[PDB]
Amino acid sequence: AFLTVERMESPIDSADDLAKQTKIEYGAVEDGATMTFFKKSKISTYDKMWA
């Protein structure tokens, strides 16, 4: 169980790993042209990151 838990997560988080996971936090400047792109252009993973 320990090895499966520590191997299920991708060792290098990518443009999709962060969206599905919750252990690792992510963020950017408050409406500093980053989340302004996140709110519009509704991509599934990008929508998850925006939420």
Binding site: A1, F2, V5, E6, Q21, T22, K23
Partner: protein, 35 residues
């Protein structure tokens, strides 16, 4: 995302009770064996 928990006393404790029961059964049959 939190599953890195070991088997504590509460997680696995009944094994101690069952082995103690086996030990007491073994001694209880051994004392009667000498009869």
């Amino acid at each position: 995302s939190k599953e890195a928990s070991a088997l504590g006393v509460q997680n696995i404790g009944g094994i101690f009770i069952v082995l103690a029961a086996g030990l007491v059964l073994s001694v209880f049959v051994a004392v009667g064996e000498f009869l």
